[PDB]
Amino acid sequence: RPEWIWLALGTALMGLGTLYFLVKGMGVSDPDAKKFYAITTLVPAIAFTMYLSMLLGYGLTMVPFGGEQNPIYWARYADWLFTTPLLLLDLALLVDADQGTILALVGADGIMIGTGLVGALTKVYSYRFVWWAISTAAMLYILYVLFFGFTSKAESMRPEVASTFKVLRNVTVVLWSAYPVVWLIGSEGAGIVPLNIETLLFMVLDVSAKVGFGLILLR
Amino acid sequence: RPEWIWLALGTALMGLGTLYFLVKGMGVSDPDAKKFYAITTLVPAIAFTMYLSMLLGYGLTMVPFGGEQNPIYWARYADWLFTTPLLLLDLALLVDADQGTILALVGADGIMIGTGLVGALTKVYSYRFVWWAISTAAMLYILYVLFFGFTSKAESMRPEVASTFKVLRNVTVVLWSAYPVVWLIGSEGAGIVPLNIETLLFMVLDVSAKVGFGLILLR
Amino acid sequence: RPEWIWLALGTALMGLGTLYFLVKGMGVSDPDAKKFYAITTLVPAIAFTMYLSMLLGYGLTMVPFGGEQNPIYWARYADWLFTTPLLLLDLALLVDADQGTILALVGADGIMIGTGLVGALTKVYSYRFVWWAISTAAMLYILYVLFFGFTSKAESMRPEVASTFKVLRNVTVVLWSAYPVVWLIGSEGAGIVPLNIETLLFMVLDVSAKVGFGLILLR
Numbered sequence: 001r002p003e004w005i006w007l008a009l010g011t012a013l014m015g016l017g018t019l020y021f022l023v024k025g026m027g028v029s030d031p032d033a034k035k036f037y038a039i040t041t042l043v044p045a046i047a048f049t050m051y052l053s054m055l056l057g058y059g060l061t062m063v064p065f066g067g068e069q070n071p072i073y074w075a076r077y078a079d080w081l082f083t084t085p086l087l088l089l090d091l092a093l094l095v096d097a098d099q100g101t102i103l104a105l106v107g108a109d110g111i112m113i114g115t116g117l118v119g120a121l122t123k124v125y126s127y128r129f130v131w132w133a134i135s136t137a138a139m140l141y142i143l144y145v146l147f148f149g150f151t152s153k154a155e156s157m158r159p160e161v162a163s164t165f166k167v168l169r170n171v172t173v174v175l176w177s178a179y180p181v182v183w184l185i186g187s188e189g190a191g192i193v194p195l196n197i198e199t200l201l202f203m204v205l206d207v208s209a210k211v212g213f214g215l216i217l218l219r
Numbered sequence: 220r221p222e223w224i225w226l227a228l229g230t231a232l233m234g235l236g237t238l239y240f241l242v243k244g245m246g247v248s249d250p251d252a253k254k255f256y257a258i259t260t261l262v263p264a265i266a267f268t269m270y271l272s273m274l275l276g277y278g279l280t281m282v283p284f285g286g287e288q289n290p291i292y293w294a295r296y297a298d299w300l301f302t303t304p305l306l307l308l309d310l311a312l313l314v315d316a317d318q319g320t321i322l323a324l325v326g327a328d329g330i331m332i333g334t335g336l337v338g339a340l341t342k343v344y345s346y347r348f349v350w351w352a353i354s355t356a357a358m359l360y361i362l363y364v365l366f367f368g369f370t371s372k373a374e375s376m377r378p379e380v381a382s383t384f385k386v387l388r389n390v391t392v393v394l395w396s397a398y399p400v401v402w403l404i405g406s407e408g409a410g411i412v413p414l415n416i417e418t419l420l421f422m423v424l425d426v427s428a429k430v431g432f433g434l435i436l437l438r
Numbered sequence: 439r440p441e442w443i444w445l446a447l448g449t450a451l452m453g454l455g456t457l458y459f460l461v462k463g464m465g466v467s468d469p470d471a472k473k474f475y476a477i478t479t480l481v482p483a484i485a486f487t488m489y490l491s492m493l494l495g496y497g498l499t500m501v502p503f504g505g506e507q508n509p510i511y512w513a514r515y516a517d518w519l520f521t522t523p524l525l526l527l528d529l530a531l532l533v534d535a536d537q538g539t540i541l542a543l544v545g546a547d548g549i550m551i552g553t554g555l556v557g558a559l560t561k562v563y564s565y566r567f568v569w570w571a572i573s574t575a576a577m578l579y580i581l582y583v584l585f586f587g588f589t590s591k592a593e594s595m596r597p598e599v600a601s602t603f604k605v606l607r608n609v610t611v612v613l614w615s616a617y618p619v620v621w622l623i624g625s626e627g628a629g630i631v632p633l634n635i636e637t638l639l640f641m642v643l644d645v646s647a648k649v650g651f652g653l654i655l656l657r
């Protein structure tokens with residue numbers, strides 16, 4: 001009930017970029033710029049639908065025993081699994097990396113949100129902190145590859161595509177370090193900050209994580 | 220009950236192309252012709268399994284309140300999400316387009332059938348006309364890109380791959396304009412033409428949409 | 439109950455390769471070797487999570503009528519659909535095949551485990567031997583393409599990438615011929631060898647199928 005404003009405002013903050021970024025897109029100047037744009041207009045568009053999902057009844061599938069109390073949203077992972085892989089596909093093409101590190105990067109995140117989604121889904125004889133750990137170890141892996149493999153290739157004769165990528169790394173690193181700590185303290189972990197606050201918190205991270213990320217890759 | 224003949228005949232009309240098109244395929248003459256064939260044999264093959272799904276009990280997940288009355292098929296979107304993206308992958312390679320417009324084209328349809336599937340699934344505090352609209356806006360987008368972006372590239376020194384693509388555009392445009400209007404009048408919208416007729420209608424569009432489409436890309 | 443040891447040991451036998459193979463990976467010597475490694479570390483990693491899924495309560499969705507007796511695991515197909523396509527992506531890049539035969543190969547397996555998963559899921563007016571057949575016909579197809587299309591390209595001026603691929607074909611062919619016969623005799627077919635034995639059987643095939651497969655592609 002008290003998450004509605006964060007739900008609808010979340011859709012409103014995404015129902016802006018999909019509108020703004022769609023106008024600049026489709027402008028055939030460079031074939032490479034086309035793929036870069038495409039994605040950073042599809043990303044806030046998939047989450048927009050998803051937030052409108054949480055707004056209009058959707059998102060439910062329980063955590064440790066549902067029906068009795070604990071309310072949860074599955075619609076969230078339904079988009080993080082369909083947002084994180086493409087957002088890295090925009091930062092892997094910038095770094096002009098080989099299909100090798102890109103592949104692991106999809107299978108890495110796939111498992112990261114797969115394992116998290118499962119973690120949230122009921123608690124069938126398993127501890128939900130088990131999966132939270134597997135998904136965290138899955139995330140650190142990316143941070144390793146991000147500030148190690150990408151950096152050892154970040155330059156490309158162009159100071160921009162190398163320093164305007166550093167600002168991306170700052171955005172992303174602080175951004176993603178966030179999600180995990182937001183889990184085991186209320187939403188789907190402990191039970192300190194219930195559902196209400198968790199819903200705003202998660203959305204702040206999201207609007208900044210996509211439109212803000214895209215609001216970098218436009219400059 | 221009265222959809223069985225349209226179900227089984229639908230499987231019969233697909234259980235023909237998968238058989239015909241499989242014989243001509245695997246003929247290594249051109250590496251490019253190989254990828255073109257592959258898909259237009261996998262498409263009527265995925266729907267064939269799906270139709271046999273609707274025939275043999277599958278397809279259920281409710282619309283506005285199930286269990287009481289309104290019978291629906293989820294197996295349908297389970298294939299449209301797995302047919303439309305590849306069928307455009309055959310018309311995007313013909314146009315020899317960049318990975319840019321191809322990508323948006325997958326994420327565009329993904330959301331088109333994702334949003335439609337959801338629209339059909341129950342009606343949890345949300346209007347099923349909301350998603351029908353989001354999926355329609357998702358479809359017009361493709362029609363824009365199809366008869367704008369593809370045309371402004373349709374030629375390629377080969378009159379065939381440019382005019383035998385125009386006949387594809389006619390097939391596709393009239394074809395897809397169909398689905399949407401078929402929704403809000405009975406099947407999962409209003410309630411004029413119930414389930415019976417809707418089942419034939421949908422299949423006519425399908426046999427023509429795939430085998431007929433493939434029966435173009437063979438000539 | 440009696441499958442626990444096979445479940446946990448299965449996770450233990452995969453919770454070894456993901457550890458071993460991760461140490462050798464990320465070693466940038468060749469851009470081509472990078473993609474080859476990536477996958478054969480992600481494969482036993484996805485199944486590892488899945489086995490830990492079967493271990494910790496997950497895997498349930500019934501076969502012919504559930505809730506009354508027949509216990510099943512859906513977590514299995516949840517990984518075979520996410521293991522078989524990538525494992526062939528490692529043997530299709532070795533053979534340096536065109537995007538044509540690779541594509542059919544993904545859509546072929548997709549339907550193979552899709553059709554099998556469905557086969558296992560309840561038995562809604564349909565015979566579970568119907569899908570078992572569709573999934574078998576889907577598998578023979580690959581064996582045709584594997585020991586026909588790949589062989590008629592296996593050489594590449596390098597005796598290794600052509601003979602150390604033959605040993606892969608032996609591993610794979612005997613390996614995959616296995617799964618199908620393991621189905622209609624107990625697990626989800628007849629009812630001779632119940633759940634207990636089926637759980638070991640399936641795991642023997644798995645540890646050998648991935649780590650052992652990977653333990654080839656490392657040499």
Ligand SMILES: *C/C=C(C)/C=C/C=C(C)/C=C/C1=C(C)CCCC1(C)C
Nearest residue numbers: 080083116135136139176179180183
């Ligand atoms: C737009 C949304 C994006 C980019 C979401 C990204 C999400 C993450 C970095 C999530 C990470 C998680 C964990 C490390 C463990 C617990 C589960 C998650 C999903 C919160």
Ligand SMILES: *C/C=C(C)/C=C/C=C(C)/C=C/C1=C(C)CCCC1(C)C
Nearest residue numbers: 299302335354355358395398399402
């Ligand atoms: C073989 C099946 C194919 C190519 C199916 C294509 C489907 C569409 C063009 C569907 C469009 C829809 C809408 C615009 C809104 C309502 C939901 C759909 C799925 C009927």
Ligand SMILES: *C/C=C(C)/C=C/C=C(C)/C=C/C1=C(C)CCCC1(C)C
Nearest residue numbers: 518521554573574577614617618621
């Ligand atoms: C690591 C797991 C792998 C590589 C699994 C491969 C699985 C198969 C070859 C499965 C085949 C099946 C059939 C032919 C019919 C019945 C259903 C299956 C899934 C057992």
